[PDB]
Every structure is written in C-alpha cells, then in structure tokens.
Design an enzyme around this catalytic site. Structure first.
Site, PDB file in Angstrom:
ATOM      1  N   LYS A 107     -14.145  -8.967  -0.653  1.00  0.00           N
ATOM      2  CA  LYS A 107     -14.227  -9.411   0.726  1.00  0.00           C
ATOM      3  C   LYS A 107     -15.684  -9.282   1.160  1.00  0.00           C
ATOM      4  CE  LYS A 107     -11.971  -9.179   5.208  1.00  0.00           C
ATOM      5  NZ  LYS A 107     -11.078  -8.439   6.151  1.00  0.00           N
ATOM      6  N   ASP A 147      -1.028 -12.777   1.169  1.00  0.00           N
ATOM      7  CA  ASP A 147      -1.597 -11.705   1.970  1.00  0.00           C
ATOM      8  C   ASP A 147      -2.030 -12.355   3.273  1.00  0.00           C
ATOM      9  OD1 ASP A 147      -2.854  -9.644   3.161  1.00  0.00           O
ATOM     10  OD2 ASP A 147      -4.338  -9.393   1.546  1.00  0.00           O
ATOM     11  N   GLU A 158     -10.272  -6.649  -5.252  1.00  0.00           N
ATOM     12  CA  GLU A 158     -10.084  -7.730  -4.293  1.00  0.00           C
ATOM     13  C   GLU A 158     -11.337  -7.891  -3.448  1.00  0.00           C
ATOM     14  OE1 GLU A 158      -6.535  -7.624  -1.879  1.00  0.00           O
ATOM     15  OE2 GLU A 158      -7.643  -8.652  -0.266  1.00  0.00           O
ATOM     16  N   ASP A 183       2.195   1.909   3.342  1.00  0.00           N
ATOM     17  CA  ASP A 183       3.228   1.026   3.880  1.00  0.00           C
ATOM     18  C   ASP A 183       4.627   1.564   3.578  1.00  0.00           C
ATOM     19  OD1 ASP A 183       1.243  -0.804   4.774  1.00  0.00           O
ATOM     20  OD2 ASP A 183       1.239  -1.806   2.845  1.00  0.00           O
ATOM     21  N   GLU A 228      -8.941 -13.601  -2.729  1.00  0.00           N
ATOM     22  CA  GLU A 228      -8.190 -14.062  -1.576  1.00  0.00           C
ATOM     23  C   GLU A 228      -8.846 -15.316  -1.017  1.00  0.00           C
ATOM     24  OE1 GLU A 228      -6.690 -11.240   1.425  1.00  0.00           O
ATOM     25  OE2 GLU A 228      -7.380 -12.704   2.935  1.00  0.00           O
ATOM     26  N   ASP A 232      -4.504 -13.711  -4.073  1.00  0.00           N
ATOM     27  CA  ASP A 232      -4.023 -13.661  -2.696  1.00  0.00           C
ATOM     28  C   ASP A 232      -4.227 -15.010  -2.029  1.00  0.00           C
ATOM     29  OD1 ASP A 232      -3.459 -10.990  -3.108  1.00  0.00           O
ATOM     30  OD2 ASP A 232      -4.773 -10.252  -1.528  1.00  0.00           O
ATOM     31  N   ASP A 283      -6.178 -14.611   7.938  1.00  0.00           N
ATOM     32  CA  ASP A 283      -4.945 -14.370   7.184  1.00  0.00           C
ATOM     33  C   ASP A 283      -3.816 -15.265   7.688  1.00  0.00           C
ATOM     34  OD1 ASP A 283      -6.176 -12.438   5.617  1.00  0.00           O
ATOM     35  OD2 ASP A 283      -5.416 -10.761   6.831  1.00  0.00           O
ATOM     36  N   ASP A 313     -11.506 -12.433   9.569  1.00  0.00           N
ATOM     37  CA  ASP A 313     -10.432 -12.614   8.599  1.00  0.00           C
ATOM     38  C   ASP A 313      -9.126 -12.999   9.296  1.00  0.00           C
ATOM     39  OD1 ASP A 313      -9.293 -12.520   5.996  1.00  0.00           O
ATOM     40  OD2 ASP A 313      -8.753 -10.420   6.286  1.00  0.00           O
ATOM     41  N   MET A 326       2.754  -5.798  -8.007  1.00  0.00           N
ATOM     42  CA  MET A 326       1.445  -5.279  -7.662  1.00  0.00           C
ATOM     43  C   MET A 326       1.615  -4.228  -6.577  1.00  0.00           C
ATOM     44  SD  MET A 326      -0.976  -5.467  -5.108  1.00  0.00           S
ATOM     45  CE  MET A 326      -0.954  -7.057  -4.320  1.00  0.00           C
ATOM     46  N   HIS A 375       0.853  -1.182   0.000  1.00  0.00           N
ATOM     47  CA  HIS A 375       0.000   0.000   0.000  1.00  0.00           C
ATOM     48  C   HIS A 375       0.888   1.231   0.000  1.00  0.00           C
ATOM     49  CE1 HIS A 375      -2.433  -3.048   2.158  1.00  0.00           C
ATOM     50  NE2 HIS A 375      -3.460  -2.500   1.532  1.00  0.00           N
ATOM     51  N   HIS A 428     -11.082 -14.802   1.992  1.00  0.00           N
ATOM     52  CA  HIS A 428     -12.259 -13.942   1.863  1.00  0.00           C
ATOM     53  C   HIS A 428     -13.455 -14.704   1.306  1.00  0.00           C
ATOM     54  CE1 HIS A 428      -9.617 -10.046   1.662  1.00  0.00           C
ATOM     55  NE2 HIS A 428      -9.498 -10.698   2.801  1.00  0.00           N
TER      56      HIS A 428
HETATM   57  O1  LIG Z   1      -5.658  -3.048  -0.096  1.00  0.00           O
HETATM   58  C1  LIG Z   1      -5.162  -4.315  -0.453  1.00  0.00           C
HETATM   59  C2  LIG Z   1      -4.903  -5.108   0.808  1.00  0.00           C
HETATM   60  O2  LIG Z   1      -5.113  -4.318   1.965  1.00  0.00           O
HETATM   61  C3  LIG Z   1      -4.753  -5.060   3.120  1.00  0.00           C
HETATM   62  O3  LIG Z   1      -4.636  -4.246   4.224  1.00  0.00           O
HETATM   63  C4  LIG Z   1      -5.805  -6.111   3.422  1.00  0.00           C
HETATM   64  O4  LIG Z   1      -5.374  -6.947   4.473  1.00  0.00           O
HETATM   65  C5  LIG Z   1      -5.993  -6.998   2.199  1.00  0.00           C
HETATM   66  O5  LIG Z   1      -7.283  -7.564   2.160  1.00  0.00           O
HETATM   67  C6  LIG Z   1      -5.791  -6.343   0.828  1.00  0.00           C
HETATM   68  O6  LIG Z   1      -5.141  -7.231  -0.047  1.00  0.00           O
HETATM   69 MG   LIG Z   2      -5.850  -9.101   0.366  1.00  0.00          MG
HETATM   70 MN   LIG Z   3      -7.821 -11.311   4.475  1.00  0.00          MN
END
Ligand SMILES: OC[C@H]1O[C@@H](O)[C@H](O)[C@@H](O)[C@@H]1O
Ligand SMILES: [Mg+2]
Ligand SMILES: [Mn+2]
Ligand SMILES: OC[C@H]1O[C@@H](O)[C@H](O)[C@@H](O)[C@@H]1O
Ligand SMILES: OC[C@H]1O[C@@H](O)[C@H](O)[C@@H](O)[C@@H]1O
Ligand SMILES: OC[C@H]1O[C@@H](O)[C@H](O)[C@@H](O)[C@@H]1O
Ligand SMILES: [Mg+2]
Ligand SMILES: [Mg+2]
Ligand SMILES: [Mg+2]
Ligand SMILES: [Mn+2]
Ligand SMILES: [Mn+2]
Ligand SMILES: [Mn+2]
Lengths: 386, 386, 386, 386
Positions: A182, A286, A180, A56, A216, A244, A256, A254, A87, A53, A219
C-alpha cells in the site's frame, strides 16, 4: 445469471462485510457482525470461503478461555457450510501500541511483540487450512522524514520476515507469506509502497521462495499505477500468491469499493489477465460496503463483487474467443511480441545487417500498430455491443 | 557562497541545458546548442562532467565520416576542460520507429534494431570513460490494455538486458547498467514504472550484479511516492548506481524543473540521505530550463541545480551535527530502530514472556514518538532559523 | 449498429484527426492533413461538423492572399458535405511569442497581440457559422511562484474577455464565449484550473451572459475531479455552452484518448447526464489518435469516439427506462432529493418540532440508502448484463 | 525567536489539538481534551483564539441543562485568557444520521434537521463573537453516480444557504458565511470540490455578499491545485473571509499536517501572498497532531504551526524588500503585468498596427522571461542563503 459458486474461489475478509462504517469523520452506521453469521451469509451467497485478522475472530486481549470459544464457534460455522479459510493475517495496525508500526516500530519491544502476535495467529491460520499468511504493513512508515531511517527499517523488516520464515520451516508448515503493498494511509508514506517494491524486497529475504505478493486493485491505483500491469509482473515473477479485489476512483483515500466499481476498464483487463494466465488462487474481496448502507446493502454489495467478476470474465472470454479479435491481435503484432528477439544469439545479431546497417527505419516507422481498432473491439465486447 | 566545484560530482545531460523548448503544445524557443559549447559553459559553472544520448552527440543517420567528426570535436572539448563523461544512454524514444517501444516493441525487427543502436553507443560510452550506461524505457508500454502482453514484454525486456550483459562481459567492459524508471509519459503506462519494479526485474536477470537503478526525483513523485524512501531502498539493495535530480510539483506531466524546486522538503531529506549514506556516484541533473527562458536563463537555471544541492547539503549537515537534534533522535528512538529486533533468536523470542504474555501494551502505547519536535528541528535548520 | 448521423451533433477539431504525433519525447509519426480531406473523411464517418484553431486552417504568417485561398478551399469543402462549423478557437499557445501566455503574458505588447489575433479569428468564425468561440488559456500560468502575480493576471484576463465581449456587442455578433479549463500542462499551473474556477471568473466579467464553459473530460480528471459532477454544476449554472469529450486515465499528462477510453464509468454517467438534462450543443471530440497509429487508425479512432457515445447513450437510456431502476431510485430517495427542503419557509421550519426537538435521529440514521443495489443495476445495464 | 503573539491572529479549532487519533485503521492514542484546558494551553502558546464545531463544545444530545454548563465553563475560560472566538461551524458529518449528507441528504427530514442544528449553533457563535460561520459539506456527495442528482443537490444546497442567509438577516446578525471546499473524503466526491466551485456557487445565492470561502491548504492540494493561486482568485473576488492552514504531501488522504510541513514552497508563496495582499482575517490552523504523539507533542506541533508561519513571513518580507529581487521583478516584467492591456480602448487597439500588422513577433519571442533567476532569489531567501 452470473451466480457465483464455490468453484469460482471467491473469498471475503471478516472485516469487509463486517465493516461497521467508522471512517475518519464519522461514527459507525452498522452493528458489529457475529463472525458465525458472516460465514453463513457468505456461504448462502456462493462464496468459497472467508479470511480474518486475528482481532476480527478473537477480540483483543481475550483470555485463553474466551479465545477457545471464539475459535470453536467459528470452526463449527465452517463445518456446517464447507466454507474454507485460504488466508489469514495479523492486525498490526488498530491498537495504539502499533502507532509507529509493528515490525518496524522504532521501539524494539513493540517489534518483538508484533512478531509474537503474528506467530500466534500463524498457528491458528495453519490449523484452519490457510495456505497464505498475508502481511500488510499499514503502520510501517512515517509522516515526516526524520522519523524513520528507512534502511534501518528495511533491516528490521527483513529480520522480521526472516524470523517468520524460520518459524514456519521449523514447524514444517506449508503456509507461505504474501506482502500486501500500500503506498500510503494511514501513514503518510508506507514502506514497500507498491508491488514492485515488495517483489524487490522479497529477493533479499533469506528464503525468498516462501514469500509472494498480495496486491490490492485499489492500492496500486492510489499511486496511479496500472494494476493489470503490476499483476503481470507479479505473475511473471511467479509471486502472485493471492490477490485483493475492489474498486478505487483514482488517487485519493483508500476507498475499498466493491470490485467492478472504480476503474471498470482496468477491472476488465485484470480479469482478462487472471483468467488467461491461469491464476488459481483465491479471488479475495477486500472491500467495504459504503457506510450509507444497512445490512441488506452490505450483502447486495458483496454479491456485487462476485457478479461483476463473473460478468467481466464472460466479456473477456468472448473477447479472446472472437476471430476478429484474434485477427486484430495479429494485426497489432501481439504474436510477434512472444517471439525471442535474438534467439540466433549475440554474435549473429551483431553481424545481421538487416538489424542495423540495412534496416529500413522509415518503412518500419510507417507501419501502424492498429491498437485503436483492437481496443474498440475490446470496448465493444465489454459493453456487450458486438 | 555555495560555489560548485568538480569534487561535488555534478553532471548534466547534453539534452538538459540543450533542451530547445518544444513541448506538446509549443514550438522551440531556443536555438540548438553545439555540444562543444555546452561542455565549456558547464565547466565554467563548476560541473564535474556531462552525459548524452547517442543522438544528442551524433545526429541520427550520420555517416561514419560525420559521426567521427562529431565525436572528435566532443573529445577535444573534454580535453581542454577536464570534463568527465560518467554516464551515457541511448535515444530509444524520439524516432518514429520506436513509437511502440525499443526493447519491447511488438515488431521484432525494431527490437533487434534497438539493441544494435544501444550496443553501438555502449562502445562509445566505454571509450569516453562512462561507468554507467542508463536505460530509460520511455516507449515501453501502452495506452490500452490489449496492445501489450506485459509478461511477453517482460520476456523481451529480460532478453534485451541479458544480451547487453552478455555483450559487456564478452568485451571485458567495466561499465554497468542502470534502469531509469518512469511511471508514465509519453506512454499511458510505462513498464517498470517505479524504483521497486526495476529493482525486482533486475533480480530475474542473468547477471543481476551488472544492473542497478538510475532513479529520478520527479518520476517517483509522478506516482506520488516518497523519493527519499525509494532511494533508501535502492541503497539498501546496493543498486543506487546513479541518480537523476530535478524538481516536480506533484502528480502531473514530467516537469523536470531544476533541482530544489518542486518538493523542497523532499529535496532536503534526499540530500540528507545521499550524504549520510556516503553515495559517491554522480549528482546528475536531468532537468529542463523552462521554455520561458533565453540562454542566460538556461545557465542560471543550471547553476541553480548545483547551488540548491549545496545549500541543502549544508542545512542537512548542520541538522545532523546539532546536539539538540541528536538528543531529539534518541527521544524518537531512532537509535532503537538500528537494534536487531531479536538477535537472541527465534526460540528465545518464543519463550520471552516480556514479548507477549507480560508485555504492558498500554504503557508502550502511551509513549509518545516525539516526531513533531524532531521535525520542527529539521524545519528550523532547513530554513536557517536556528 | 451504433452508426453516427449528423443529428447526433458530433464534431471534431481539425487538430484532432490531424494531430501528427509529435509529443515531448517524440517526432511526428503521421503526415500533415489537408483540412479539406479531413472535412470529407469526417463527413463520411457521420460527423456533424468540424472546429479549428485559426492556425489549423490558415498557417501562421499567411499573406492576405494565401489566407483567402485557405479559407476558400475550406468553405468549398463545407459546401459539398454540409459539414457545419459550430465552434472555433484561437491558437494562443504554439508560437514562441506566447511562451508566458496570451491574454496574461507579462509583456503588455504580447497581450495586445493576443487580442488582435483572437479578434481576427472571431470574424472568420462568425462568417462560417460558429455559435461558440472557445478560449483555452494553455499558456496562462507559471512554473514558479514569483513569476506571475495572479491577481494582476486575473485583472488582465478580465480585461481581455471584457474587450472581446465589447467587440462582439459592437459588431452585433451572436457568437458566445466558452472558457476551456485545464489545471496544468504545458504550464506548471494554469489559471482558471477547473470548471469551478472558470464559472466563478465569468461572474466578475462585464457581460457574464456572454460567457460559459467548454469543459473537457480529461482536464477535470487531471485534477482528480468528478467530471459528471462538474458538468451538472455547469448545467445548473446555465453555462454549458459546449463540451469536449475524450478519455483520460487519471492524474497524469493530458492523454486526449478517444471518448469511451479512460474512465468508462464516468463516461457512462456523463452521457446519462447530457441526455437526461437535454443538452443540445455539440458533442465535440478533442482527442488525439495515439501516435502508434497510421491514417487507418486515425479514422478508426475517430469512429470510436462516436460509437462509444452511442453505445453509452443506449445503456443509459435503458437504465433510466428500467422499472426496477425506477423502483431503485425511489428506494434511494432520489425523488425526495428534488423536493424543497423547507418550502414552508424559515419561520415554519424554526417552529417545526419534528425537525429537531422530536426528530428521531437514530431511526433516520438506520434507514439504509440502498445505493449499492442501485449502482449494481447501473453496472448491469452498462455491461449489457440484464 | 519567532514567538507568536495575539496580534498575529493565530487561531486553532478545538478539534485540532483535541484530535484523539482515531483514524480509519486505528483506535485513539490520546485522551479527550477538556475544551477549557485547550483554551488555556493555546493562550499560553500565544494564540489569538479558538474555533469549534457545536459538537466539540457541547456533546451531542446534551440537555439544555448540560449545554448551559458546557457553554458557561467555556465562556469563563475565554474571560481569564482574553481568547477570542472568530469562527464557529456545525458538525454535519460525524453522526450516523448524516451518512448521506446534511443540507443535501436525499432524505428531506435529515435536511431540515441539518438546518436546525446549524441555526442553533449560529446563535451561540454570534454570542461568543464569531465573525465567520463556516460550512464544510463533508458528507455532501456520493460514492456512485446514480446516488446523487447533482443539480437537485445544488438546488437543495442553495436553498439551505439561502435560508441561513435569510435567518441571519432576520436576526440582524453581523456574521458572514464561508464555504470550506474539499474535493473528496469521506465521500468519494464532495460537492463544491474546490475554491472555484464554491466561489461560482456563491454567485447564484440570494445574498451573495454574505458568503465567502474558507479554503484549506491541504484540500486544494488533494486535487493537485496551486493553493497560492486559488487564494489569489479568492482575494481577487473579495471572498477570502477566512483561511485554513496546514500541510499536505500531495494527492492522497487528508493529512492535516501542521502548517509548514507538506509543500513548503507553496507555504512560502502563500504567506507571501496573504501578507502582501493585506489579509487581516484569522490565520486558522485546521491540522491534526499525528497520532504518534502524546500531549507534549500535540502542543509542540501546534507551536510549530505558528512558528512556521512566522519564519515564512520573515523570509517573504525579506524577499520582497531585497533590491536585487525588485530588480529581478522588473526584469521578468511583473510591473508590466499590472498595466492595463488596452486602456486606450477597443477601437484604438483595433487600429494599432504595432499590435498586429507591424508586431515583430520574433523579437518579442526572443525576450527571455528571466523567471529562473527570480525563483533562485526566492529560494535563496527561503533558505536563508543570501
Ligand atoms: O492486514 C490485511 C488487511 O488489513 C485490512 O484491515 C486492510 O483493510 C487491508 O489492506 C489488508 O488486506
Ligand atoms: Mg487488503
Ligand atoms: Mn484498501
Ligand atoms: O534516456 C535517458 C534520458 O532520456 C531523456 O530524454 C529523458 O528526459 C530522461 O528521462 C532520461 O534520463
Ligand atoms: O484552444 C482550444 C484547444 O486547443 C487545443 O490545442 C488543445 O488541445 C485543447 O485543450 C483546446 O480545446
Ligand atoms: O466543519 C468544519 C471543519 O470540520 C472538521 O472536522 C474538518 O476536519 C475540517 O475540514 C473543517 O474545517
Ligand atoms: Mg532521466
Ligand atoms: Mg480542449
Ligand atoms: Mg477545515
Ligand atoms: Mn523526467
Ligand atoms: Mn486535453
Ligand atoms: Mn483537511
């Protein structure tokens, strides 16, 4: 044994091994990771590359100055390792401003802000080599029924993704988008809750060819759905742009978990499908090292993601390669499934008396499918018991 | 109070009030209903009309002779009541021959048989006035991962629905198709498991305009999904050709309780949506009087389906009509949701500094959504406590 | 490889391999099995013995004459094979009379009938060697909230099981009872829905020592619970009198897949627990060969139940026997878990300053649990990848 | 209308209206509340009192000095309002030290620390008037099967609660304990996952009379269980010492919506049970104002908890008081349910030929339960449509 190499196209988000362990009921148990250290530790484990992200990599509210240094450090880390960035994605969920969503916030100015935040990171993603830009609408949704007019929200979501498509076409970028899905969390119900919903939505977009899904494992399983089936539908549609991978123990928050944990048999049927269908995109993890772990456990957990994929890949390949399995597949008529039902056409079918008037229904009904023997062969292979 | 009339477009399947009560662990508790008696009892309750599987109306394996008498009796019952037949469907699930599916059985001859069985009932449906022909792929699926190649099965399903589309176009029929999604049961996982999956699949069909969805309240809820949201997506797509109404208490076997039971609040938000979006198709009840009931309870239960819709319709209409609610809607910015996010276009958005550089994020973040007050107004209305 | 023998104590219900394939949406796909043939085919597969509902062995409403011949045939089949009958149970669910339950029907005469039906089969069970008499309250429950006063129903259930306890004490029988919990289906919610609820209920019975649980893998998983954990609680309580093994893919209708399918990892942790805790009761398979199968697949599916247990038993035994695993167990402090928390007593604990005032909390917090490495060792063993 | 008063015994945790909005994917949206302000705002809304975790009232690691000032301020706030403190609890989940649990951490010193932390707050609770001390084992559990020996963990949990029981008996305290079950989150599976499991566990404790349950609406519903049923079992056992009320939309993350939202019909049947069974403990709301809200919405949401209980209480009281309902109850034989099944004793039952040999089973089977009409009466009342 089962040592990952870059040709296995394993990638990890910065936010995965970097997850500090704050959950709804708990403070962080690990210190924040320098993105540069993560690039290196992941390369030493055999990974193909990393994802991020915006927030991040560049902390929120960074000056242009500080943004530049954060990107420069990162790019240098990619240089000395050869790590790829296939990605990237936008954080449209953490900051309080997005509490009612990004692209579908009821407040219009928050929606415009969300698009500007996404568009800024698209540029960075394209510069770093990203082929897929992922959208996760974590905050698009509602806890209560009156709070969101879902048709208006779908209008706003189509308009957002139409604008992003218009932007990448104007810049001549090659990058493509992947929604993605969810079903819920952190909203009570999230819009486009499954692979199906995202695939349908893409077909109303202005340039549908630019959009695919990033499904994912966990999800779809949070809605109790069959992830290998949903993936086959995505592949059937030509929209599996990215994937994912992780673990989930059924319908609950969730989790993970690392790939391989959770629904092990579904993991096997998943690897069996990706490999036999020739998926060539990233095998992206992920996941979150459980907050019980220290940094040694973070890296063991990440190593576990790749190892479990590799073990499963070997079991599935041996399953398909086994002559008893190929004989079991014919016994269950999987080859007849690939045959056109009526390639002789509608009229021929209408006149075929063996299709109705002279169809011996009780004889066809009494033909067992031999599905159980085929599945025990799959089980035997998965467990190495052949 | 709340007495249904034909203008409310309430319809019931023959198999609903006619359900005899055999469940996985139990024998039947009620005798079989003469379809003629059901047409009359339903008309006396205020229903708009009835629906049927072929095998509900004409018992399986009927001679052309006996088929004719069963249809004639039925048509006479429709005459003396004015009962309509807006929808019909095929039984591609009960007979042992369909144990691995109809359109996606691994056996090719069973697939051709399924199409002939469907095509025969299409004719009958069109003669009786049916505007929608529903497909429920109850048996399309698998209990185990090797038993079904899902991409090949999607090929076979597209080829089946493409043939049915080619058939109705060749006969010049007006009837349209509606896929009825279900996530599981009686198969471990059913193909096209949700509204999303069916909507996506329709877009790969050859004449997508001929196909919509027939979503069932309980089926989306068996995947834990928000049925009012999925319906808004179907309406947004223009594909809500038909709808099945009933009750379901969360993720478990398909209960088919009477509409109103199960998730009452979701029922309210559903009626609120159908009415405010101007849905004009049948309000069809695909439910089962619990096997604890005798025939008096069957008819009370069916009456309950319509009564609960009518009560909910009145509560939702009063909710929307309430000025405090209209003021609450603006307070939560539902009107801002209907506004285009960037009707000034991409370039204007890119240069708008109030969209990013000068966006006060903390001020927007501190604006409460006032969602809870709006929801208590909805609750107050639902409970009559205003 | 992995060939079952009678010393493995594998048992099957008559109703399992004998299941004809009628499900809510489908007619039977297989012919009814002669109980005598099932005893023989199961003995040829290596099973330890069989179990039955009264109505599996003696068809409902049998004359004393016909009852005698059905029992005699059966007893002769047990003679020539050595097949044991460790458990029997009553069918208090199929017949329409039980539509509102057996022991907790609202009708009092149905409750008295249920007890007489149970008591008659207890005698037969004891004569055949049964050590456990299982109660499954499939019909004890409700679809709606007003239909059952649950406290009164608990009164009626306690009174029923108190009477059965008084009966077996008066006859000097050795047999013990085991409640088989199920959360739902065919009732909307079933009383005593989980292992926990049944264990608690037993403690209010008059002779609690006579009652334990017969937990089923799939039933706890239908509530999304951890079956290995619930079993550990049953063992901890001393109440694991019996156990039903099978497969279930998460929260949905009761699938009764063969053991090993469904949640494979949970199956592994289950076998690991039964074996390491020294469970010595029957390994009973309450499963259903999917209705897609013919008789060959029925027997392959049953063989799969035992084979999967045996493979899993070998993987778990090797997991525990592995020195790296024993070292991993200490690294995760599983040995510290077995230590008394405060065997120095309350007062010593209250005065221990290293327990609070001088407890370095941040040092203890920074000790990783090393859970992920331990779990990858378990995964490696399960998959044979060591 | 529906204005709460202290005699309604509504209480709120400090952590409820005080929840700042940090969720797994999001930063806080509201500022921290001064506990003193919460006591006052809640008293102005009509609440009976407040509850707290130690760490809500006294920030972690407070000096004896600062601890004293925090308690003094709080006690002064209780004085000027008359607000009661009926329940208190320990935070054994937030701090990183508890990442593997409190009473069942694998590390023994963390277990001893947990007990000292609990025992310190017991004293404070007793001084403030608390009648129930709640234990929520949020961290007692595991994400993976090898990480926790559940029987050893049950040993450690019994030893902890036995020590707390020994402590309160030594101080002559009146306070009693209530285990608050939760099936999962933040651990993958939590020990004592449901009301049943906690009730069973209590019966192996040394002084079982000191321990009851504090069930939460949403937690049982996260396992898909019937909360009104579980409450009836707790009441039947005499163990409903306390109760947590809130909303939950099915099986997913712990939502903690305001009471009334989520499963509205279950909320109605719950209030109907508490009131008709004469529950006299606190009506405690363990909910979270959604992070979309500002402080005005926090207080509206809390007001909604009490209002919805009061509306539901009025609908249930009118339902029971309605003569048509009382006639419907007899029609469904709810009165026969309260009758002893065989108060004539075992022998009389064994000789009663109307209980078996001369039981007309088909006549009893053909008696409808009239459950649907009774439920539509309940629905009509709930919706005010009578
Ligand atoms: O925005 C993309 C990613 O954000 C992450 O914080 C989430 O855990 C994921 O579900 C997602 O792949
Ligand atoms: Mg994800
Ligand atoms: Mn997840
Ligand atoms: O085939 C259409 C119908 O078949 C019925 O038997 C099922 O209960 C429904 O899910 C479906 O609407
Ligand atoms: O009554 C005992 C048995 O009855 C069977 O019909 C059910 O499938 C099982 O859940 C149960 O073990
Ligand atoms: O410890 C008692 C309380 O802790 C809170 O943080 C949790 O939200 C509740 O489940 C519980 O009632
Ligand atoms: Mg339907
Ligand atoms: Mg069973
Ligand atoms: Mg709580
Ligand atoms: Mn249904
Ligand atoms: Mn079962
Ligand atoms: Mn909660």
């Amino acid at each position: 044994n089962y040592q990952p190499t870059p040709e296995d196209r394993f990638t990890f988000g910065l936010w995965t091994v970097g997850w500090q362990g704050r959950d709804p009921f708990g403070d962080a148990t690990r210190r924040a990771l320098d993105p540069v250290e993560s690039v290196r530790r992941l390369a030493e484990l055999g990974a193909h590359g990393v994802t991020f992200h915006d927030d991040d990599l560049i902390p929120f509210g960074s000056s242009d100055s500080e943004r530049e240094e954060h990107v420069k450090r990162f790019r240098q880390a990619l240089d000395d390792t050869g790590m790829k960035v296939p990605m990237a994605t936008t954080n449209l969920f953490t900051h309080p401003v997005f509490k009612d969503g990004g692209f579908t916030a009821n407040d219009r100015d928050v929606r415009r802000y969300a698009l500007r935040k996404t568009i800024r990171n698209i540029d960075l993603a394209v510069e770093l080599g990203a082929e897929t830009y992922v959208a996760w609408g974590g905050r698009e949704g509602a806890e209560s029924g009156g709070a969101k007019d879902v048709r208006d929200a779908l209008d706003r979501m189509k308009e957002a993704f139409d604008l992003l498509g218009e932007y990448v076409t104007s810049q001549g970028y090659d990058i493509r988008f992947a929604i993605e899905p969810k079903p819920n969390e952190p909203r009570g119900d999230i819009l486009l809750p499954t692979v199906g919903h995202a695939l349908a939505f893409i077909e109303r977009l202005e340039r549908p060819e630019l959009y695919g899904v990033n499904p994912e494992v966990g999800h779809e399983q949070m809605a109790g759905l069959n992830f290998p089936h949903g993936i086959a539908q995505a592949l059937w549609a030509g929209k599996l742009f990215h994937i994912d991978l992780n673990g989930q123990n059924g319908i609950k928050y969730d989790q993970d978990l690392r790939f391989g944990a959770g629904d092990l048999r579904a993991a096997f049927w998943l690897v069996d499908l990706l490999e036999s269908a020739g998926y060539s995109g990233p095998r992206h993890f992920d996941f979150k090292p459980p907050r019980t772990e220290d940094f040694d456990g973070v890296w063991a957990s990440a190593a576990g993601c790749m190892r479990n994929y590799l073990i499963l890949k070997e079991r599935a390949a041996a399953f398909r390669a086994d002559p008893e399995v190929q004989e079991a597949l014919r016994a269950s008529r999987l080859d007849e499934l690939a045959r056109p039902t009526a390639a002789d056409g509608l009229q021929a079918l209408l006149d075929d008396r063996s299709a109705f008037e002279e169809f011996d229904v009780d004889a066809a009904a009494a033909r067992g499918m031999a599905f159980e023997r085929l599945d025990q062969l799959a089980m035997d292979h998965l467990l190495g018991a052949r």
